[PDB]
Each structure stands twice: as structure tokens, then as C-alpha cells.
Design a protein around this motif. Structure first.
Motif, PDB file in Angstrom:
ATOM      1  N   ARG A 273      -4.686 -26.506  35.077  1.00  0.00           N
ATOM      2  CA  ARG A 273      -4.333 -27.916  35.025  1.00  0.00           C
ATOM      3  C   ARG A 273      -2.841 -28.063  34.769  1.00  0.00           C
ATOM      4  O   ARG A 273      -2.275 -27.378  33.912  1.00  0.00           O
ATOM      5  CB  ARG A 273      -5.119 -28.641  33.934  1.00  0.00           C
ATOM      6  CG  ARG A 273      -4.891 -30.142  33.925  1.00  0.00           C
ATOM      7  CD  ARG A 273      -5.542 -30.803  32.728  1.00  0.00           C
ATOM      8  NE  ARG A 273      -5.345 -32.249  32.740  1.00  0.00           N
ATOM      9  CZ  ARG A 273      -5.663 -33.052  31.732  1.00  0.00           C
ATOM     10  NH1 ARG A 273      -6.191 -32.551  30.625  1.00  0.00           N
ATOM     11  NH2 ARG A 273      -5.450 -34.357  31.829  1.00  0.00           N
ATOM     12  N   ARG A 274      -2.208 -28.958  35.519  1.00  0.00           N
ATOM     13  CA  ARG A 274      -0.783 -29.210  35.391  1.00  0.00           C
ATOM     14  C   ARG A 274      -0.546 -30.699  35.191  1.00  0.00           C
ATOM     15  O   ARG A 274      -1.278 -31.538  35.723  1.00  0.00           O
ATOM     16  CB  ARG A 274      -0.015 -28.710  36.618  1.00  0.00           C
ATOM     17  CG  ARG A 274      -0.179 -27.225  36.878  1.00  0.00           C
ATOM     18  CD  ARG A 274       0.628 -26.785  38.083  1.00  0.00           C
ATOM     19  NE  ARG A 274       0.280 -27.546  39.278  1.00  0.00           N
ATOM     20  CZ  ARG A 274      -0.765 -27.280  40.053  1.00  0.00           C
ATOM     21  NH1 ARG A 274      -1.571 -26.275  39.753  1.00  0.00           N
ATOM     22  NH2 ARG A 274      -1.007 -28.022  41.124  1.00  0.00           N
ATOM     23  N   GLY A 275       0.486 -31.018  34.415  1.00  0.00           N
ATOM     24  CA  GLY A 275       0.794 -32.397  34.098  1.00  0.00           C
ATOM     25  C   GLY A 275       2.181 -32.823  34.528  1.00  0.00           C
ATOM     26  O   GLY A 275       2.709 -32.327  35.527  1.00  0.00           O
TER      27      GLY A 275
ATOM     28  N   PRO B 164       0.384 -29.768  31.155  1.00  0.00           N
ATOM     29  CA  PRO B 164       0.201 -31.139  30.658  1.00  0.00           C
ATOM     30  C   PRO B 164       0.602 -31.311  29.205  1.00  0.00           C
ATOM     31  O   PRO B 164       1.101 -32.382  28.838  1.00  0.00           O
ATOM     32  CB  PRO B 164      -1.298 -31.387  30.864  1.00  0.00           C
ATOM     33  CG  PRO B 164      -1.905 -30.030  30.807  1.00  0.00           C
ATOM     34  CD  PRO B 164      -0.902 -29.102  31.426  1.00  0.00           C
ATOM     35  N   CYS B 165       0.402 -30.299  28.368  1.00  0.00           N
ATOM     36  CA  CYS B 165       0.736 -30.387  26.954  1.00  0.00           C
ATOM     37  C   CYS B 165       1.220 -29.020  26.487  1.00  0.00           C
ATOM     38  O   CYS B 165       1.403 -28.099  27.288  1.00  0.00           O
ATOM     39  CB  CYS B 165      -0.470 -30.878  26.146  1.00  0.00           C
ATOM     40  SG  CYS B 165      -1.889 -29.764  26.197  1.00  0.00           S
TER      41      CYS B 165
ATOM     42  N   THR C 251      -5.459 -25.079  29.510  1.00  0.00           N
ATOM     43  CA  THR C 251      -4.978 -26.283  30.179  1.00  0.00           C
ATOM     44  C   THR C 251      -6.133 -27.203  30.549  1.00  0.00           C
ATOM     45  O   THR C 251      -6.016 -28.430  30.445  1.00  0.00           O
ATOM     46  CB  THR C 251      -4.169 -25.912  31.420  1.00  0.00           C
ATOM     47  OG1 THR C 251      -4.993 -25.162  32.321  1.00  0.00           O
ATOM     48  CG2 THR C 251      -2.961 -25.077  31.034  1.00  0.00           C
ATOM     49  N   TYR C 252      -7.257 -26.633  30.982  1.00  0.00           N
ATOM     50  CA  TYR C 252      -8.463 -27.391  31.289  1.00  0.00           C
ATOM     51  C   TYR C 252      -9.474 -27.351  30.148  1.00  0.00           C
ATOM     52  O   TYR C 252     -10.684 -27.434  30.386  1.00  0.00           O
ATOM     53  CB  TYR C 252      -9.096 -26.883  32.583  1.00  0.00           C
ATOM     54  CG  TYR C 252      -8.685 -27.678  33.797  1.00  0.00           C
ATOM     55  CD1 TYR C 252      -8.691 -29.065  33.774  1.00  0.00           C
ATOM     56  CD2 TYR C 252      -8.280 -27.044  34.962  1.00  0.00           C
ATOM     57  CE1 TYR C 252      -8.315 -29.799  34.879  1.00  0.00           C
ATOM     58  CE2 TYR C 252      -7.900 -27.770  36.071  1.00  0.00           C
ATOM     59  CZ  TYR C 252      -7.919 -29.146  36.024  1.00  0.00           C
ATOM     60  OH  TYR C 252      -7.541 -29.875  37.127  1.00  0.00           O
ATOM     61  N   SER C 253      -8.997 -27.213  28.911  1.00  0.00           N
ATOM     62  CA  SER C 253      -9.863 -27.287  27.743  1.00  0.00           C
ATOM     63  C   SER C 253      -9.234 -28.106  26.624  1.00  0.00           C
ATOM     64  O   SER C 253      -9.734 -28.068  25.493  1.00  0.00           O
ATOM     65  CB  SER C 253     -10.210 -25.886  27.229  1.00  0.00           C
ATOM     66  OG  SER C 253     -10.949 -25.159  28.193  1.00  0.00           O
ATOM     67  N   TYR C 254      -8.158 -28.835  26.902  1.00  0.00           N
ATOM     68  CA  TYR C 254      -7.466 -29.660  25.919  1.00  0.00           C
ATOM     69  C   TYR C 254      -7.752 -31.118  26.256  1.00  0.00           C
ATOM     70  O   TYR C 254      -7.284 -31.626  27.280  1.00  0.00           O
ATOM     71  CB  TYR C 254      -5.966 -29.369  25.932  1.00  0.00           C
ATOM     72  CG  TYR C 254      -5.201 -29.977  24.781  1.00  0.00           C
ATOM     73  CD1 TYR C 254      -4.736 -31.282  24.843  1.00  0.00           C
ATOM     74  CD2 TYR C 254      -4.936 -29.240  23.636  1.00  0.00           C
ATOM     75  CE1 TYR C 254      -4.034 -31.839  23.794  1.00  0.00           C
ATOM     76  CE2 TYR C 254      -4.232 -29.790  22.584  1.00  0.00           C
ATOM     77  CZ  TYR C 254      -3.785 -31.088  22.669  1.00  0.00           C
ATOM     78  OH  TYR C 254      -3.084 -31.640  21.622  1.00  0.00           O
TER      79      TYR C 254
END
Ligand code: ZN
Lengths: 81, 71, 215, 98, 129, 97, 130, 36, 24, 210
Positions: C109-111, C124-125, C190-193
Motif C-alpha cells: 500500500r502506498r499513500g 501512507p504512514c 502498509t496494508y495492516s495499519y
RNA sequence: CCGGAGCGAAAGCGUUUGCCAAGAACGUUUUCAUUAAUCAAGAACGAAAGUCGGAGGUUCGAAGACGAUCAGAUACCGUCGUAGUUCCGACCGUAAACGAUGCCGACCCGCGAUCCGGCGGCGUUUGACCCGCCGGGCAGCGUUGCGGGAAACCACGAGUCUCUGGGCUCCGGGGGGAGUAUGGUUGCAAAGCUGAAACUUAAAGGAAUUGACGGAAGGGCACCACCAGGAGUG
RNA sequence: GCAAGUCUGGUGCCAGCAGCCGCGGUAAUUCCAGCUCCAAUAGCGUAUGCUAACGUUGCUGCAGUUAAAAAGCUCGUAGUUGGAUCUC
């Protein structure tokens, strides 16, 4: 997540735990998505409708997986109070 | 642990200043010693007059004669 | 040469029943066959051996030297995998680790940093991975900063699709075996926050095991 | 590395115990750390109980017993094969052998 | 002894959240806690809470929605100006997209975004994301 | 790979210096049902020892190829291994009465 | 002491052929030589030696390694056994006083097939420590 | 003979095998041979 | 042993005081 | 089941009292304290039969939700529930492991005995800890006949009952087999089931010949 | 009797009885109303050994003598034995003084025991015992620890630290030189506290793995070993 | 490490190289040279300070069971830090 223009940029939206609102990771093999069938009001037979519940591995390993499904069944009027 | 008080700037400043002397690299550059004993006296290079021609042997496991000079 | 699946998950992806690989990640289904990985991502999937570390076992007659292979594989957008295999020969260790590195391919996952324009470029964070003693913190960065990291974790971040990052590692980063696994662990989160944009109630769908039960 | 959680003795909430002396070497060993062995055996061994029974002046006389409290230090208890070394996980079993 | 009761409140919430609890009881009640829990509630991090009012400090029972990652305090409670507020956002908040820094200004206890609109600084209580 | 593609049983190719202190590199490549003891080691696996001399010395070539079981054929031995007992399938006799 | 090669080959003989083998070593040796192609003559006698030894065990009872259709049918027949009357279908059921209060809380606490059994005084259900 | 045969021996020789570049060179193998 | 090295230093600096106190 | 037709009748509660389904031993798990009614004077915990019936139908709902009945795995390692789960598998159409569960059956794909079900049902969570622990490596749910002193480490639907005891465990497998069939189009729910609960009772070899 | 039991700030504390003062926990719908927490330079206490002045001196026993053992044995073993070991007064303030883990406070798993106070419950025995509950305390097991850590291991946390901040004191900065030199200070002395530098060195060290080895334990196997013997050999 | 020769001749633990690990023990990819190649470039190497490396001085932001480490313990002032509560 959006791109400030209506473009959903997440490649996949993971399932949140129905008991703790936790993100079920892609490698959470202990996670469980159990389906609970709905019965008819007059005869109590299986019609084809069911309810979906997802419980992550942490809640399930901790031992609160059956209590969460029990409370989730009472909320959806599946088991009696 | 550390004192996180809003009026502990004196305690922190005094503690950090004292513990810096337990640093080997700091106590070497902020004292009279290691500079008075330094033959160059804090210089880069130095000139001298050759006195002898001595040859020190290399330490183990090496085996050679290092061509040195007594200056 | 032909792929014959042994698990029911491989039978579905072979009969064109499962469309995208995300359905596997959506239901946390274990990928036990490496042929399922390159079925979806086999077009653009570039691996790279990070280090061949020879390990030795003291025996009665001498040392039994075995060779590891830390292979980092990724499609350079959203998917990255890391695999470790320790065999006697270096050739079979590399081939064995590529299979394990494919089975470990996870979504990324990217933000955005501040504004949101175009496509996600950074994390993302602030996510932090941990393995052994070395921990690595992946911090978001502006649009055109690039991967500001050591050469070892930079390969994982470039193969995952992350363009910008501000990493800060602490511990025995000289151990590449633990440094790479810690960086791969920071990308797993990233995909668990849980973030405010993921607060909508989860709408469940039929799993591929249930949708194609009779088949 | 710490080999035992109880430090090889039984002392919780105390600072000092009375040291006792061993039996076969007379070494000062703490009372709680010593390896005790209460042996209760007859004065006459089984090889001579019949000869004493034939020489007994009574009709039904039960032979007495010899109560001996033995305190062994760790050095002598291992040497006398009273206690032995055990596996890293088999050390935690506190039940005496049947 | 019990100093900085706001720390003991947010530590109890942060712990009970990671355990998966739905309700957490806070032993000491304070107006600083209620003003802190109200900002967390206005952004959708915690649910409703009943201020149990005995004839003492009082207790609070807060509902948890599972959306909070961590809530903590800044123990020295430094004085944050309107220029140094940007520095605190980078260090404490995990992202520029979410997370808030609850401040204490003359206009009342509020987050950092509201302090920018009202153009006022003050002291920093903690953070939540 | 050539022996595996052309054949059934594995082999073993050892081309290096066996006994040395500087050339002491065994470099053994063993796989595929390698027999070393007993009498059947004669007509089931054949060994070939050849030499290759190079600029730095001479190297040996030890090759032990095992032949598959071929009845009355020159591909392999026409006799089974002693450690193998093949039992035929039971007779399917449905005509009981 | 036999080895695994004879142990394995001896069990497969009984699993496939049971209406042909006997209890005599010489007779079982003949049928084993007829259907099974054993290279060595000594090994062939070793298999027939252990096959006849298993017959004394099979005739005595079932075994965990060999499953013949003559002993499975007996298990399948006794598994489907159904008594004439149910063991749970009793005329008098004795229950304690605590479980009677549980049924009273339910919508059916008045049942004729219930005998309120009074538990004995004292609580000595634990084992003595030491 | 010798009373302790398992000993060093000469000055430039040892009881165990040792290379001058630990495998690398033009007369022995054992150097970096990972990616081949 | 470390306890005997401490015992030697105690006996070493003890005679150092003797040869230093005798010169005053 | 919260309706009126899904309530247990008099003949069902009589079988629970005759078998001993409410007796729950002397120990108690903190995860099972909501299913116990009250501890007796002799240390025995009485299991609430009404809560058992609710967890039974909740378990039967998940079984019917599985389209292919073969995707349900019924494992029993102890001899007390060997023939009970075999008759349960035949009455419904599910799979079963009545012998010893080989480790790696759910994880080792290249193994011969490899079976990947969609719903695991074990008899005793403690005695069947290996199938439960192995099913945690996959996404296999769990329905377990849990006693009072039974851990819920990987249990998703805990059925409070007396798992130990021949007549007790055999009745639970018979009760669940009937409710799963009643929820389908097989049993009219008005006429009692032809299968007697004595078919699921494990018999010792000493009592079989008599 | 004597326990992974109690008490004490630690060190430490075990015959009966009496006296003097003190203390924790529990109980309270008593009282004061922030009086609190941790704390530089200060101060009390502080095992054993040691010092000073008396009393005493059974055993044990530094030193020492002698008898063994050994290549030597001023050691280990044995026979005698001084100072000590005990008490009173006054010093020294040191230990592997250890849980190698500072003190106060909050949140945080489960289960069964144990000591003390209190509460409730059904009987047995003339308070004792049995079943639960509450507070405090010494601990244990399951955690295959929701977590932590380099492991070992940790629920008297070593948990709630990159998602880094409850309060405060002491204290560490590669290994040696070195707790040494010098100075100050304390002491009858021994010594304590404070305490460097020149110089030297690329490692020292922590936990765990495999192997080798043991005058470590258990279980086994051959006359290239042995017992019982036959031939010898030297 | 750190981009760049299993090249050729010479030396043979010698002479020398090497910040560190090391190299040279008669077949040296590390020495002395030839050829080739690499890096920056009108620059570049070295010596000594200084900064980032160094979260190895840690206010942000380190540690003190076993790797260096919590005073033997307690009391005690300066110092530091202090429950809730008044118009919401
Ligand atoms: Zn002894």
C-alpha cells in the motif's frame, strides 16, 4: 484512499475484523471468514441467505473467537438472548 | 531515567557536560595531556634532523625489517 | 513442463475462476504453489540475489559449507517478495529461493505526502519493521526525493513500487540476512495499519472457495 | 547464563539461612540448598532378620528401625550418585522418583 | 504518586485498545480529560462515554470503536508557538494525512488544525492517531 | 542432466582432485539411486575412470552410471535387484457362484 | 529378525490374497512363488516364513497393519448395531437439586420422569494435597 | 620418532591445510564462485 | 585468579608507602 | 436459532439428562464461564442446556452454509468418538479422520493424505490440539464440543457439553446430525428421526460380543 | 520439627518464660485536609574477617611444628596447635552485601495452592476441618506469552520505547594501564571514599548452534580389548 | 570494503604493500615493472584539526538481569515533580 479526484487508488481494500475492527492482513492465515445460514420464519429450513463474519487471527488465537461470534449472532438476531 | 521536568534544563546541562568527560575521544582533545605528550604539539608536519638509522622488525605474523630513522 | 495444481486454490486460478491476485490477498488465502504467483505477475517480475552467505557446520571430519540466497523479487508496483534458501550448491540455492520469494509476494500500500495528485508515490504512514536486532522505519517523503536509504533496503523499496522514503535503521544493519527481512517486514504493515480512509464498514463478498464450490 | 530460576536453592523472601554441615565431607552447606535424604531402614538387614528371629527370646517382636537424616552437599551428592544431571527441560521436574 | 492524571487516562485507553476491548474505565476524572476525549470523539476515534459522578474525583467509562492506533501525552507539556507547531507535527504524527495534536490555548483545549485557523498557540497535551 | 534425460537411474560425476592439501576439492555430484556395496554393484552400475591433463596439472573423471531394469534388452540388466519384491495384483473373480 | 523388505512384501501378500494362503510354511511358499516373482530363493522363503507367522495372529484377532475384508465386515456389522431399546430412553431419571433449579428457569421444569436426588452433606470432592 | 606427532612441524608449514589467498589464485579454486 | 592480583597490589602499594614515608 | 420452531422440546432435554451432557467436571475455563449454570456441592459444574442448544443450531447453520458437504472435516482422535463421527459423516456427507491425524495433512501439499476442507469440527479441543493447531496455518474454521475444562485456543463455535463420556458425546453428534439435516430438505422436523442415538455410542470390545 | 513458610529497611533472625518499646496487613460511615513522590553536600544501620581495652577460652582452627603422599608438595590427606572462633565497650564500613534486576504510581493473561486480617456458607469434631469471597505478602505453573529481547529467558515484567515523553535519584561510553600514581579526606592500624595520565591494544565480551574432548553420568558393542586358557615372543 | 586484469616478467616472509582485514613461505589478481583498465579531472594525493557519519553523549533520541553498568540498605534538607474542584 482516493486521488483527490474520485479515483480509488488502493489496489485492494482488506477485510476489517468484525470483532475488533482490525485489518486482516494478506498473510493472516489464522483469519476466519465463517458464514452463518439464515432459516425461514415458518419452517426453519435453509433458504439461501447467510451472514458473513470475519475474525482475525489474533482474536481467534486469543480465545475470544466464539464469544465474538456469539455477540455478533445476537446482534443480527441469530441466536436467542 | 531522565528528568523530563520543564525546569530541569540546569540538571540536564550539568549532567551532559560531566558525562562527556567519560568519552575517550572527548577527554583527549579537551585536556593538557595528549597534547603536551604529543611531540608535534598539534601541528600537521614537522622538520627534524636525522640522528640514526634504526630498523624495527614487523610484528607477527609478518616478518620483515621496517626501514626507520631516529629523528 | 505443464502445471498440474495440487491445491484447490491452484485449480481455480488455472481454470480462470479467480480473476485478480487481490482476491487471494483479500481472503488471506495461503499460496502454496509458486506457479500461482507468476500466473498473474509473471509478465513483469524481476528478481535479484542480495547476498550469497556461506554458512558452515563443524563436523567430525571438517566443515560442511552451505550457501544461502537472499532473493528479492517484485513487480515494481505494489508487489514485493523476499526468499531465503540454504542449500549445498549455490545454483540450486538461488533457484530454490526464487520459488520462496514468489510465495512471499505481498501487496504494498502506498499513500501521499500532503496533497494527492496522480498516483501514490510513498508509504501512507510511518511503518516500522523488526527482525532480530535491526529495525527500519519507513517514513513518507515528498514527491521527488527518491528512496533515501541504504543500498540493501533500496532494492526492496524500488521493487515494491515505493518511489519516495526517508528510512532510519537502527541495530546491526551489517547483517544483510536480518536487514532485508526487517525491510520486508516494514512493507508488510502498509496494508495492516488502520487509517481514517479505511473506516467504512466492510462489505463482504463470496470467497473463491464458496463461489466455485461445486467446480 | 542463569542456569536455574531458583538459583539452585529454595530461598524466597530471606537473606540468610543457617548453614549445616555435610555428612561424608563436613562442608558448610546452607540448609535449603543441601540435598536431604531421609533414610529409614531396619537395624538388622534382610540378610540377618531370620537369624535374629530364631535367636529372639520373644514370640512376636517387631525389629526396630534406624532413622538417619542425611545432608549432602552438591559435590558429594553427585559423586555418590544420589542425584544426577538432567536435560535442560528435564531439570524442571520437582517430583521425586518413585 | 499519581501525577499527570491525563497520562494515566490515555495509557489506559491505548492499552485497552490493543487488547481489543470495547469499554475502558478511567479511574480519575478531570475536565482536561473530558476536553481531550471530546476532541478524540469529534473526529471519530472514540464513542460516547458516561462521566460517573460520585462525590469524589469521579470515574469515566469510554466506549472504543477500534479506530484508534495509539493515544499518548507529552509529559513536560512544552509551550508550542504558532511557528514551532509544524515541527511537532512531523515528529509525533505518523502522517500528514491524519493524526492530531491536542493543544491547550487561550481559546480552549483543541487540536492543532483548529489552532491554525484561530491563529493561536499554547501548550501541548498529547496526540492521537 | 544428459544421463537423466537419456536413462532412468541417476549417476555420479566426480571430476576434481580427491586426495591433496591444495587440490583437496572433492566436488562430488551424487544423485539418483546410487549403489555402492554388494554383488549387484557389478551388473547395475558401471564405473569409468579417465584422465584429463591441463596446464595446471591432470584431473580425474570418475563416472558411476546406473542402468535401468530392462528385460532381455541391452539397455540395462535383465535381472531385478535383490531388494525388490513385486507382487501381482489380485485376481478379479466376480464369478463366485 | 526380519528386515523391512521382507516385512513389507509379506503384508501386501495377505492384503491382496487371503482365500489362497494357509497356515503351513510349505503350502504358503508354493502360492507365494506362483503369484509373486521373487529374485532370490532364500528371500522368497523369508517372505513365506513371516506370512505364515502373521496367520497365527490374524486367526487370533485383528491386526493394525493388515486389513482383510473378512475382519472389516465384522467391524462394519458391529458398528451398525442398534439395541432394541435406547439407553437414554429410561422410565426414571434421577437428577440433583441444582440441575432441577436450572430446568425450572427454563420453560419446562415440571416433568414426571425426574427424581430430585439430594446430594450428600459436606464438600470433599478434592484430593488431599501432599 | 616423535612423542607428540600431532604438532606444527615446519615454520611455513602447518598440520592443517592453508592457502595463500584462501582459494583465490591461478593454482587452486575456492574463491568467490557464487553467481555462475 | 583476580583476588590474588588484588592481594599483590595491596602488598605492592603497602611497601611503596614504606619507602616513601622513610624519605620524609 | 431464535424462532419458535427452533426451540428444544421435552424429548431433547430428557436425553441430555439421561446421557449426562450437563455434567462438566471439576475444573472450569475462564472462556467457558458464560456457559455454566452453577457449580454443585461435589465440585461438578452444570452446563446450561439452553445455551448448548443455541450453540448447536449456530453450529448447524455454519455447516449448512457449506455448499459441498464434503468440505466439512470431522476429526476425533479419542476412541470415545470414533464411530460417532463416522456415522455423522455418513448421515451428512462430510469427510472424517477417525484414526490418528497425521501432522501436515492440512499443510504439506505434496503429502499423499492431503485434504483441504472448508470447516473443521473436532470432538475435544485438548485431545485434538494437533488438528486445531494445524488448521490455524490455513483458513479453516472450528466447531468443537468444548467441556468446562477445555481451552478455546482455536475454537470458533464452542459447543458446551460433556465431551468425555460415551453416551454424552454420541448424543451430541446425533443432535448435530439431526439439526443439520432438519435445516436441509431431508427431515420434516415433525416426525422423530429414525436413527437412534445409540448408533453413535462407542462400545468397548468387552460389551460388543454381549 | 524446618517448608521454594514467616518477620525485618537491609545485614540478618529458630529452646521455655517474663518484661520494655516498636511494626506490617486487615477492620472503620473516626480524625487532619495535600500535609505528598523521589531526593546533591549530610546521617543511622550494616555478614564474615581484621584492630583496641577487659572477661572467657569446650570444639574448631589462619600461622607454625610433625607424619604421609610426590620428581619436588612450604599443598590436597592425617596427628598436635597460636591468633582467632564466644561475651562487654569502642573503631573499620567491606562481600557473588545477588533477584548480578533502584524507588513511587497507572494500565496489562489465566489457573491452582500458601501465610495474615476480614466476610459469608452445610456439615463433621472439642477453636480444629471443609467450600467460596475481599485486601495484603513470599512464590509457582500454564503462558509455546496479544507483548519484549542479541538469545537464554521475563507476568516479584526484563510487558504497555521509532505507535520513541508519569515523577525522581544514582550510574555506563572498546579492552588494558587501574581502582594504579598523585592530591584531598577518614582511620590506632589494616584500609575506605574521591581518583587520573603517559603509554599499550583490534579486539575483549554476551547468548546460542554444531563438533571435538573430560580422571562427568546412563545405556551398548569386537580377543586388532579383557576375564578364564592355549602357543609364544622379549 | 570500493568503480577497475585466474594477464606477463622479476623478488621468494627478502625487498616491500597495507587507513582496517591482510599480501610476500619460488606458479603473488595485493610487492617491483610492462601492458591493459577504473575513478575524478586542471586538478589530485597525503598529514593534522573540525562536521556529518554516531541513536558510539541520546532534550528530540541511547543504555544499567547475564555483554561497561542500580549506591548494602534506609532516613534526610536544597533541587525537580505534584489528585480532583469555581460560567458550562
Ligand atoms: Zn559432601
Amino acid at each position: 484512499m482516493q486521488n483527490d479526484a474520485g479515483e480509488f487508488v488502493d489496489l485492494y481494500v482488506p477485510r476489517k475484523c468484525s470483532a475488533s475492527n482490525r485489518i486482516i492482513g494478506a498473510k493472516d492465515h489464522a483469519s476466519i471468514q465463517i458464514n452463518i445460514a439464515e432459516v425461514d420464519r415458518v419452517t426453519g429450513r435453509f433458504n439461501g441467505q447467510f451472514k458473513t463474519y470475519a475474525i482475525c487471527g489474533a482474536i481467534r488465537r486469543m480465545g475470544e473467537a466464539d464469544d465474538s461470534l456469539l455477540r455478533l449472532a445476537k446482534t443480527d438476531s441469530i441466536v436467542a438472548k | 531515567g531522565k528528568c523530563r521536568g520543564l525546569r530541569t534544563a540546569r540538571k540536564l546541562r550539568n549532567h551532559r557536560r560531566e558525562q562527556k568527560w567519560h568519552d575517550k575521544q572527548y577527554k583527549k582533545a579537551h585536556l593538557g595531556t595528549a597534547l603536551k605528550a604529543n611531540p608535534f604539539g598539534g601541528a600537521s608536519h614537522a622538520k627534524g634532523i636525522v640522528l640514526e638509522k634504526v630498523g624495527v622488525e614487523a610484528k607477527q605474523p609478518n616478518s620483515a625489517i621496517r626501514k626507520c630513522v631516529r629523528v | 513442463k505443464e502445471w498440474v495444481p495440487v491445491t484447490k486454490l491452484g485449480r481455480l486460478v488455472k481454470d480462470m475462476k479467480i480473476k485478480s491476485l487481490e482476491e487471494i490477498y483479500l481472503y488471506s488465502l495461503p499460496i502454496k504453489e509458486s506457479e500461482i504467483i507468476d500466473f498473474f505477475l509473471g509478465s513483469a517480475l524481476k528478481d535479484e540475489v542480495l547476498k550469497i552467505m556461506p554458512v558452515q557446520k563443524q563436523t567430525r571430519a571438517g566443515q560442511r559449507t552451505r550457501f544461502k540466497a537472499f532473493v528479492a523479487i517484485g513487480d515494481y508496483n505494489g508487489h514485493v517478495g523476499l526468499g531465503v534458501k540454504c542449500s549445498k550448491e549455490v545454483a540450486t540455492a538461488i533457484r530454490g529461493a526464487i520459488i520462496l520469494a514468489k510465495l512471499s509476494i505481498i501487496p504494498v500500500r502506498r499513500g501521499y505526502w500532503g496533497n494527492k495528485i496522480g498516483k501514490p508515490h510513498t508509504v501512507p504512514c510511518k511503518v516500522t519493521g523488526r527482525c532480530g536486532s535491526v529495525l527500519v522505519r519507513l517514513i513518507p517523503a515528498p514527491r521527488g526525493t527518491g528512496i533515501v536509504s541504504a543500498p540493501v533496503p533500496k532494492k526492496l523499496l524500488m521493487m515494491a513500487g515505493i518511489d519516495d522514503c526517508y528510512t532510519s535503521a537502527r541495530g546491526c544493519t551489517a547483517t544483510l540476512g536480518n536487514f532485508a527481512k526487517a525491510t520486508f517486514d516494514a512493507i508488510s504493515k502498509t496494508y495492516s495499519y488502520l487509517t481514517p480512509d479505511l473506516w467504512k464498514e466492510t462489505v463482504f463478498t463470496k470467497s473463491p472457495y464458496q463461489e466455485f464450490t461445486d467446480h | 547464563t542463569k542456569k536455574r530460576r531458583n538459583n539452585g536453592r529454595a530461598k524466597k523472601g530471606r537473606g540468610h539461612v543457617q548453614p549445616i554441615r555435610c555428612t561424608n565431607c563436613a562442608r558448610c552447606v546452607p540448609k535449603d540448598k543441601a540435598i536431604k535424604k531421609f533414610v529409614i531402614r531396619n537395624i538388622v538387614e534382610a540378610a540377618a532378620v531370620r537369624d535374629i528371629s530364631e535367636a529372639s527370646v520373644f514370640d512376636s517382636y517387631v525389629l526396630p528401625k534406624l532413622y538417619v537424616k542425611l545432608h549432602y552437599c552438591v559435590s558429594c551428592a553427585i559423586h555418590s550418585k544420589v542425584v544426577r544431571n538432567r536435560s535442560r527441560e528435564a531439570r524442571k521436574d520437582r517430583t521425586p522418583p518413585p | 504518586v499519581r501525577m499527570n492524571v491525563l497520562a494515566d487516562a490515555l495509557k489506559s485507553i491505548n492499552n485497552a485498545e490493543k487488547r481489543g476491548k470495547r469499554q475502558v474505565l478511567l479511574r480519575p476524572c478531570s475536565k482536561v480529560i473530558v476536553r481531550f476525549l471530546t476532541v478524540m470523539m469529534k473526529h471519530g476515534y472514540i464513542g460516547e462515554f458516561e462521566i460517573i459522578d460520585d462525590h469524589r474525583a469521579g470515574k469515566i467509562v469510554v466506549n472504543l470503536t477500534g479506530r484508534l492506533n495509539k493515544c499518548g501525552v507529552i509529559s513536560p507539556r512544552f509551550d508550542v508557538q504558532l511557528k514551532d507547531l509544524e515541527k511537532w507535527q512531523n515528529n509525533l504524527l505518523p502522517s500528514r494525512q491524519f493524526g492530531f495534536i491536542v493543544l491547550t490555548t487561550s481559546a480552549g483545549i483543541m487540536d492543532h488544525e483548529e489552532a491554525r485557523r484561530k491563529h493561536t498557540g499554547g501548550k501541548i497535551l498529547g496526540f492521537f492517531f | 542432466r544428459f544421463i537423466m534425460e537419456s536413462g532412468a537411474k541417476g549417476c555420479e560425476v566426480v571430476v576434481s582432485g580427491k586426495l591433496r592439501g591444495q587440490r583437496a576439492k572433492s566436488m562430488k555430484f551424487v544423485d539418483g539411486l546410487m549403489i555402492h556395496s554388494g554383488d549387484p554393484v557389478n551388473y547395475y552400475v558401471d564405473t569409468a575412470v579417465r584422465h584429463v591433463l591441463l596446464r595446471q596439472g591432470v584431473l580425474g573423471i570418475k563416472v558411476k552410471i546406473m542402468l535401468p531394469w530392462d528385460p532381455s534388452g541391452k539397455i540395462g540388466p535383465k535381472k531385478p535387484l535383490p531388494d525388490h519384491v513385486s507382487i501381482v495384483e489380485p485376481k478379479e473373480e466376480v464369478l463366485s457362484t | 529378525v526380519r528386515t523391512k523388505t521382507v516385512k513389507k512384501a509379506a503384508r501386501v501378500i495377505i492384503e491382496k490374497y487371503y482365500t489362497r494362503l494357509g497356515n503351513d510354511f510349505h503350502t504358503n511358499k508354493r502360492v507365494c512363488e506362483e503369484i509373486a516373482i521373487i529374485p532370490s530363493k532364500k528371500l522368497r522363503n523369508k517372505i513365506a516364513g513371516y506370512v505364515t507367522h502373521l496367520m497365527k495372529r490374524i486367526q487370533r484377532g485383528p491386526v493394525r497393519g493388515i486389513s482383510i475384508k473378512l475382519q472389516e465386515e465384522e467391524r462394519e456389522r458391529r458398528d451398525n448395531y442398534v439395541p432394541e431399546v435406547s439407553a437414554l430412553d429410561q422410565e426414571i431419571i434421577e437428577v440433583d437439586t441444582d440441575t432441577k433449579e436450572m430446568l425450572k428457569l427454563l420453560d419446562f421444569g415440571s416433568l414426571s420422569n425426574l427424581q430430585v436426588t439430594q446430594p450428600p452433606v459436606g464438600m470433599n470432592f478434592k484430593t488431599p494435597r501432599g | 620418532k616423535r612423542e607428540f606427532e600431532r604438532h606444527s612441524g615446519s615454520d611455513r608449514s602447518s598440520v592443517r591445510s592453508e592457502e595463500k589467498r584462501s582459494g583465490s589464485g591461478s593454482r587452486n579454486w575456492g574463491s568467490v564462485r557464487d553467481h555462475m | 585468579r583476580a583476588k590474588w592480583r588484588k592481594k599483590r597490589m595491596r602488598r605492592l602499594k603497602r611497601k611503596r608507602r614504606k619507602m616513601r614515608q622513610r624519605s620524609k | 436459532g431464535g424462532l419458535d420452531v427452533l426451540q428444544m422440546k421435552e424429548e431433547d432435554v430428557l436425553k441430555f439428562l439421561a446421557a449426562g451432557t450437563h455434567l462438566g467436571g471439576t475444573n472450569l475455563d475462564f472462556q467457558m464461564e458464560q456457559y455454566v449454570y452453577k457449580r454443585k456441592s461435589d465440585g461438578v459444574y452444570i452446563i446450561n442446556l439452553k445455551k448448548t442448544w443455541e450453540k448447536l443450531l449456530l453450529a448447524a447453520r455454519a455447516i449448512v452454509a457449506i455448499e459441498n458437504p464434503a468440505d466439512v472435516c470431522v476429526i476425533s482422535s479419542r476412541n470415545t468418538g470414533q464411530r460417532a463421527v463416522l456415522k455423522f459423516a455418513s448421515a451428512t456427507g462430510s469427510t472424517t479422520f477417525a484414526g490418528r491425524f497425521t501432522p501436515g495433512t492440512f499443510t504439506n501439499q505434496i503429502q499423499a493424505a492431503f485434504r483441504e476442507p472448508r470447516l473443521l469440527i473436532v470432538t475435544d479441543p485438548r485431545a485434538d490440539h494437533q488438528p486445531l493447531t494445524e488448521a490455524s496455518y490455513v483458513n479453516i474454521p472450528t466447531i468443537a464440543l468444548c467441556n468446562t475444562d477445555s481451552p478455546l485456543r482455536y475454537v470458533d463455535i464452542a459447543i458446551p457439553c460433556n465431551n468425555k463420556g460415551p453416551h454424552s458425546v454420541g448424543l451430541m453428534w446425533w443432535m448435530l446430525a439431526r439439526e443439520v439435516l432438519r435445516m436441509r430438505g431431508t427431515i420434516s422436523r415433525e416426525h422423530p428421526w429414525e436413527v437412534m442415538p445409540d448408533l453413535y455410542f462407542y462400545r468397548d470390545p468387552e460389551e460388543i460380543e454381549k
